[PDB]
Design an enzyme around this catalytic site. Structure first.
Site, mmCIF file in Angstrom:
data_model
loop_
_atom_site.group_PDB
_atom_site.id
_atom_site.type_symbol
_atom_site.label_atom_id
_atom_site.label_comp_id
_atom_site.label_asym_id
_atom_site.label_seq_id
_atom_site.Cartn_x
_atom_site.Cartn_y
_atom_site.Cartn_z
ATOM 1 N N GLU A 134 30.811 15.177 20.468
ATOM 2 C CA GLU A 134 30.367 16.518 20.095
ATOM 3 C C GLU A 134 30.268 17.461 21.289
ATOM 4 O OE1 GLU A 134 30.439 17.977 16.342
ATOM 5 O OE2 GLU A 134 29.521 18.902 18.117
ATOM 6 N N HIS B 11 25.725 18.763 8.496
ATOM 7 C CA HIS B 11 26.341 19.505 7.404
ATOM 8 C C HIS B 11 26.418 18.611 6.196
ATOM 9 C CE1 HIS B 11 28.758 21.379 10.941
ATOM 10 N NE2 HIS B 11 27.536 21.879 10.874
ATOM 11 N N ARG C 140 31.903 32.233 12.419
ATOM 12 C CA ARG C 140 31.149 31.701 13.556
ATOM 13 C C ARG C 140 29.950 30.809 13.183
ATOM 14 N NH1 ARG C 140 31.041 29.344 18.324
ATOM 15 N NH2 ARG C 140 28.829 29.161 18.903
ATOM 16 N N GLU D 295 24.976 13.983 13.458
ATOM 17 C CA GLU D 295 25.263 13.948 14.891
ATOM 18 C C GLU D 295 24.005 13.497 15.624
ATOM 19 O OE1 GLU D 295 25.841 18.182 14.990
ATOM 20 O OE2 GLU D 295 28.030 17.967 14.951
ATOM 21 N N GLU E 135 30.211 23.320 2.015
ATOM 22 C CA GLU E 135 29.459 22.837 3.161
ATOM 23 C C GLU E 135 28.245 23.690 3.463
ATOM 24 O OE1 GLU E 135 30.726 20.709 7.262
ATOM 25 O OE2 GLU E 135 31.442 22.780 7.182
ATOM 26 N N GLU F 105 29.240 12.494 16.684
ATOM 27 C CA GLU F 105 29.208 12.707 15.243
ATOM 28 C C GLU F 105 29.979 11.566 14.590
ATOM 29 O OE1 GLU F 105 29.633 16.757 12.411
ATOM 30 O OE2 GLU F 105 30.820 16.580 14.230
ATOM 31 N N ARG G 214 25.924 24.179 6.261
ATOM 32 C CA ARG G 214 25.764 23.936 7.694
ATOM 33 C C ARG G 214 24.391 24.110 8.350
ATOM 34 N NH1 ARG G 214 27.951 26.748 10.683
ATOM 35 N NH2 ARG G 214 29.184 25.668 12.298
ATOM 36 N N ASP H 77 0.851 -1.183 0.000
ATOM 37 C CA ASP H 77 0.000 0.000 0.000
ATOM 38 C C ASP H 77 0.893 1.242 0.000
ATOM 39 O OD1 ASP H 77 -2.623 1.384 2.191
ATOM 40 O OD2 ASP H 77 -1.851 1.969 0.240
ATOM 41 N N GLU I 61 27.689 14.898 7.703
ATOM 42 C CA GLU I 61 28.249 14.930 9.049
ATOM 43 C C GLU I 61 27.064 14.885 10.030
ATOM 44 O OE1 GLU I 61 32.151 17.809 7.803
ATOM 45 O OE2 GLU I 61 30.675 18.528 9.273
#
Ligand SMILES: [Mg+2]
Ligand SMILES: [Mg+2]
Ligand SMILES: [Mg+2]
Ligand SMILES: [Mg+2]
Lengths: 438, 437
Positions: free
Chosen positions: A188, A244, A310, A133, A327, A195, A329, A52, A131
């Protein structure tokens, strides 16, 4: 290709497989599945297993549409954990309509589609470096999880030593012996957070491993009295898990984002591709960050890119030559990998296909600079609520064309409910405040 | 050399290593790493493994420094304790920048720097014989620490009989198999405290075993329902832990402190060596004694003494190739590489400037008044992390001992730690003020 029919049948018999798990994925990304005994392998390999398909339509399926399961032999996998009566193997199947045509509402087909759209522009493939986590909460006596983090570790620290739990080190050992190509892993920033970085591979194949990963993880985790949750913001005031996505367009077998001559060595294909996502970022977020919780993690809080900063939405890693990637993020582990990439790929094609350029690389000003200060520049802000992210998703054009009919129609609809539920809900927080002050 | 690339490759196969721990150390001392499957031993050996460098800077991270990892083959080890799909190995590495240069903000590499200075002065090696004391506690059903001591023994007592626990014992039997060279071990002056001494070693080799040590202890301790804690002052009332350090410089192989025909047989290089540690002790304490809790265990007066109660510097009896200076203030909470760095610097700053060491300590220092501390060599150590930091900040050599970088961040990480503790409202406070005032 890789595996062959006979090759499978030989491997099933010779290894004793008695439970074939024909698995797929629904609009939300949850690992869907239809199990059949080894004796049905025949009917399955001929692509005659009917199920289904209304399933794939999240929690909004009305009638009971019928569809077929087209397994892909190159994904034949035999799980390490045994059953008492035999081994269990799997196949990832593309959904098909009764008319031998790929179901337009299948999340894995929608990708092989945009992927075909890629090739029309003269490109060999689209590799992904995810990546992902996650957190590992302890299980109580009964069986239900609890906000009991499994360890007090810190960023890159050396979580529980080899003599004990260390569920991480094990998921890896397994993922490896199972067939994965993981680059490395570490603890992490948040306690009990981890990660695991995979190598790269074709979009459709990466989305394939993201699924298998989340699955393998949860399994092992359980076998350690733990609960694994790829939920964006589990606990308030603690680091959130993300995912990421390392992107890279290949053409004629060579990275189309590199330029061992142009500044930053970024080909013209790169910059273009870059600007593309930016243009559609604020919009495809409702896809890359589905759940309501997702935005509780967006407090890349800013829309900008550069070599490093940052909280940048994008970021081109050191690595040059082949490893010339981009990347993104903002994406989280809750996102559907087949839609995260579909939406992401297009957002970059529309830049290449339409040749676009973005403002100069963000120097060293994003966090400090106020909002309106980031308003006096090409630095906008991602939507803050899934409600607001969806509005910017229904109005975007390439996005809508990135998921087509079914996917768009149903997604928007489903996700709307999600939000309506969450907004019409009276939370403890409310009482805490208004209940007495008013 | 000790392990050619080829050799390791031969080892990892034959022993079946399915997990390589590429471990290092951050500015705060915490032991960290990046785990890779054996299926990447090459990519790593070639120094191509990347990790977020800012992990070093600590909890004060901002951006991401794409740095590299350079494994030191000679630090090859294969943890006794095995995973399942195989064993687990490791490599203490050095952090490098994308441009093949040694990250200047890394401790392990910092000590190496300060070693070049020690060499650009004719000296060959700078050994260390640590004496890391620690406490062992019980765990509750939930698997959480507690203030219950695994044993109620005392000084050099015969801790837990050979039947059962004896966590300390296995700890050592394990380190022996691992390759450490242990001298001895006893039971410190407090219930549940212990001490394990290691054969002196090279500035780096030793710092490395200090780190490897805390790990093996920490591990096996859990393997016994216990909890190892190198915290300096676990709890009020009982004795505190400390990590004495037996410093000893060598030149042309032989000891440069010995001197058969001379006063105490302590060469000028030694006397001057003591000297440099006296005028800097108060200025490196903040490094050697990082934690705000360190100072709760330092309640003390800068001055050397061949023999006395608790003097900052001490001179063990044995001489000849064993002649050495002992800095009894340092504790296990200190980042080993920085402790040595800061000390080797305070030490070398006395060898290259020829400093005159003030008279040693004689009678008890517990009976030394404060006005006389201004006259006699009674310059007590800093009382709180705050005062210790200011002092560190003051001294130049100490700042040149960690370089702009490692210094810039240490001061920050440590200053905030303090302010955190400061702006806090502790129970004690309420206990003594809510009723009175
Ligand atoms: Mg991360
Ligand atoms: Mg990254
Ligand atoms: Mg002792
Ligand atoms: Mg001693």
């Amino acid at each position: 290709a890789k595996y062959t029919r006979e090759d499978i049948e030989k491997l099933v018999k010779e290894e004793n497989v008695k439970y074939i798990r024909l698995q797929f994925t629904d609009i939300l990304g949850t690992i869907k599945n239809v199990e059949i005994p080894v004796s049905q392998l025949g009917k399955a390999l001929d692509n005659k297993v009917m199920f289904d398909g209304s399933s794939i339509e999240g929690f909004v399926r009305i009638e009971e549409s019928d569809m077929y399961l087209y397994p892909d032999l190159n994904t034949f996998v035999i799980f390490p954990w045994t059953a008492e009566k035999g081994k269990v193997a799997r196949f990832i199947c593309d959904i098909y309509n009764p008319d031998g045509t790929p179901f337009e509402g299948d999340p894995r087909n929608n990708l092989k589609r945009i992927l075909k759209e890629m090739e029309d522009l003269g490109f060999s493939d689209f590799n992904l470096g995810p990546e992902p986590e996650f957190f590992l909460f302890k299980l109580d006596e009964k069986g239900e999880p609890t906000l009991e983090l499994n360890d007090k570790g810190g960023y890159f620290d050396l979580a529980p030593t080899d003599l004990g739990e260390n569920c991480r080190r094990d998921i890896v050992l397994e993922l490896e012996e199972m067939g994965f190509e993981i680059e490395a892993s570490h603890h992490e920033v948040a306690p009990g957070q981890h990660e695991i970085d995979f190598k790269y591979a074709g979009a459709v194949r990466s989305c394939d491993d993201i699924q298998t990963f989340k699955l393998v993880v949860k399994t092992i985790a359980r076998k350690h009295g733990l609960h694994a949750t790829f939920m964006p913001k589990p606990l308030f005031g603690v680091n959130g898990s993300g995912m990421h996505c390392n992107l890279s367009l290949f053409k004629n077998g060579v990275n189309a984002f590199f330029d061992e001559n142009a500044d930053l060595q970024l080909s013209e294909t790169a910059k273009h591709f870059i600007a593309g996502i930016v243009k559609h970022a604020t919009s495809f977020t409702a896809v890359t960050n589905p759940t309501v919780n997702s935005y509780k993690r967006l407090v890349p809080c800013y829309v900008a890119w550069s070599a490093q900063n940052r909280s940048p939405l994008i970021r081109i890693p050191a690595s040059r030559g082949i490893s010339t990637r981009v990347e993104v993020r903002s994406v989280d582990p809750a996102a559907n990998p087949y839609l995260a990439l579909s939406v992401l790929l297009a957002a970059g094609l529309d830049g290449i296909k339409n040749k676009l350029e973005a403002p100069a690389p963000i120097d060293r000003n994003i966090y400090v600079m106020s909002k309106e200060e980031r308003m006096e520049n090409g630095i906008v802000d991602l939507p803050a609520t899934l409600a607001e992210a969806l509005e910017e998703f229904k109005s975007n054009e390439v996005m809508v064309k990135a998921l087509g009919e079914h996917l768009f129609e149903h997604f928007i609809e489903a996700k709307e409910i999600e939000w309506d539920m969450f907004r019409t809900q009276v939370h403890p927080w409310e009482r805490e405040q208004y209940m007495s002050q008013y």
